[PDB]
Design a protein around this ligand. Structure first.
Ligand SMILES: CCOC(=O)/C(C#N)=C1/CCCCCN1
Lengths: 300, 237
């Protein structure tokens, strides 16, 4: 069980920790988050009371260092930092726990939600999508655009997701135009899986990360990426059976966790109706289809 | 984007462009089987690819053999069309390649866009104009070459005959669109109009009769009358 201590909470802010969130009042005696489960990536995210513009946050893994939050009054945000003095850090944390100035990461023992949303997400892969190498954690916010978005403007602050484009020479073999456009198996299995991702775990990890950035920060290009990666599997006639079965589980927990009131902007009607009802895999996503129909029948 | 009434001038500018019509690519006759079921028999078709400024028609004949053993023929026809248009472009010298290809039906956009990925600088565009190019098989000499073909074949025509010696391309395309709209609405009457006068002939190297300018005005008026008529006959007005 690890800890992310806070120097202080100078401004009123809703703090998120994974799928949990709580309100901290301006100058309330809040000194961070304890009992964070080890073995998973986490995200700690922020929305200022006074400017709901820019949700922002940090992906991190407590196995990779000791991290804390400190408000910067110049740049105007809560910043994650690393404390390299291990003894100074344990001593800080222990004083804050003794005086009980920390919230407890509030995981119910029955609850596998976070594991199920982050099964294939690895910090090392996140750090290749979010390029800021001097730090072991990664900043994301609502406004960051994706590399593909910039092609259609700051490269250092981009999300470098894998470019998927169904009408591209990468996706379409000369002489197999119709075949490859209607059945994307070649593009999924040879180009993407074997050539770029190497295995379906990396594929699913990026897919899961895209969804989480879309959900927690309303990052529009992440949502585009998540839907593209779903659609590429569903538009492929030939998909490993274990991938299909795992995709069904992945999406099921994603749809389960989405806020009900956000379904209108985080869910692309065209992609979902095609995946569940028209595509090759229309009959292969039983759990996802059943929750989608019982929770968002409007979209469909 | 799309091509509508606001930009007639762009059709006749000096940027090479082609209209592509796929409506006669996959043609069938529907009939009863001995068992009383229904079956189709395909007949030869054509891709109608037209430079509206020069009148050059690239008539790609689709021989029925191309459909043998194939499934989902109406979807395949759009991709076959795309493939043959892309092959045509690659066969033209760079300075003759089109800068835009306008498809007369939106279902062709994706097939053509995918076949032309090698040509990122050629714009693939839809149109809102209701062009009557499906009636191209009402032009006797075009119908004749398609039906007689025994193999795939490309045949080059000028759909305006010699008209550009005397009129502009905006007027030639307007006359062609008018003759074709009339042939599409009532082929018999349209054809009677064009041929009632035995003394006005079709030169061997032409598609349409050799009308003088005065006679074209009379002809063009008569086709309007026909289109307007049929439109009443149809709605009762
Ligand atoms: C049926 C007769 O149609 C036309 O004469 C016509 C059309 N559609 C146009 C628009 C295209 C460009 C030239 C202007 N004349």
């Amino acid at each position: 069980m690890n800890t992310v201590p806070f120097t202080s909470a100078p401004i009123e802010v809703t703090i998120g920790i994974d799928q949990y969130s709580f309100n901290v009042k301006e100058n309330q005696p809040f000194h961070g988050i304890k009992d964070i489960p080890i073995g998973h990536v986490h995200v700690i995210h922020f929305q200022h009371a006074d400017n709901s513009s820019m949700r922002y946050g940090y992906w991190f893994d407590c196995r990779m260092g000791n991290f804390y939050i400190q408000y910067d009054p110049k740049d105007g945000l809560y910043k994650m930092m690393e404390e390299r003095d291990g003894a100074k850090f344990e001593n800080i944390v222990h004083n804050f726990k003794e005086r009980q100035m920390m919230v407890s990461y509030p995981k119910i023992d029955e609850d596998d939600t976070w594991y199920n949303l982050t099964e294939f997400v690895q910090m090392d892969k996140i750090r290749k999508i979010v390029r800021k190498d001097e730090n072991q954690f990664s900043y994301v916010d609502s406004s960051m655009t994706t590399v593909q978005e910039n092609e259609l403007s700051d490269p250092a602050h981009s999300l470098n997701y894998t470019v998927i484009n169904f009408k591209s020479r990468e996706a379409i073999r000369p002489g197999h135009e119709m075949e490859d456009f209607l059945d994307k198996s070649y593009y999924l299995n040879t180009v993407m899986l074997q050539g770029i991702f190497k295995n379906s775990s990396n594929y699913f990890g990026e897919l899961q990360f895209a969804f989480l950035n879309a959900m927690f920060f309303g990052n529009y290009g992440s949502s585009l990426q998540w839907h593209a990666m779903i659609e590429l599997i569903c538009s492929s006639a030939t998909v490993p059976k274990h991938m299909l079965d795992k995709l069904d589980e992945i999406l099921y927990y994603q749809i389960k966790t989405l806020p009900e009131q956000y379904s209108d902007i985080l869910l692309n009607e065209r992609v979902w109706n095609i995946c569940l009802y028209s595509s090759f895999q229309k009959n292969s996503l039983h759990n996802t289809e059943k929750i989608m129909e019982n929770k968002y029948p409007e979209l469909l | 984007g799309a091509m509508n009434s606001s930009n007639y001038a762009e059709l006749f500018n000096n940027d090479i462009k082609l209209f592509v019509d796929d409506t006669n690519v996959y043609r069938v006759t529907v009939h009863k089987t001995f068992e009383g079921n229904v079956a189709t028999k395909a007949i030869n078709g054509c891709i109608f690819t037209l430079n509206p400024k020069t009148g050059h028609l690239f008539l790609k004949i689709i021989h029925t053999s191309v459909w043998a053993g194939q499934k989902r023929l109406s979807q395949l026809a759009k991709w076959k069309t795309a493939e043959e248009v892309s092959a045509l472009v690659r066969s033209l010298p760079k300075e003759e390649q089109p800068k835009q290809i306008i498809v007369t039906r939106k279902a062709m956009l994706d097939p053509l866009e995918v076949h032309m990925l090698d040509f990122p600088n050629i714009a693939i565009r839809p149109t809102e104009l209701r062009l009557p190019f499906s009636a191209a098989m009402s032009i006797d000499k075009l119908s004749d070459v398609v039906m007689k073909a025994t193999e795939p074949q490309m045949v080059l025509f000028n759909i305006y005959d010699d008209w550009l010696d005397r009129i502009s391309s905006y007027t030639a395309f307007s006359r062609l669109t008018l003759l074709l709209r009339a042939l599409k609405t009532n082929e018999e009457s349209a054809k009677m109009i064009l041929l009632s006068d035995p003394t006005i002939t079709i030169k061997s190297y032409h598609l349409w009769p050799s009308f003088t300018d005065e006679q074209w005005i009379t002809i063009e008026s008569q086709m309007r009358d026909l289109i307007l008529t049929e439109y009443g006959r149809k709605y009762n007005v």
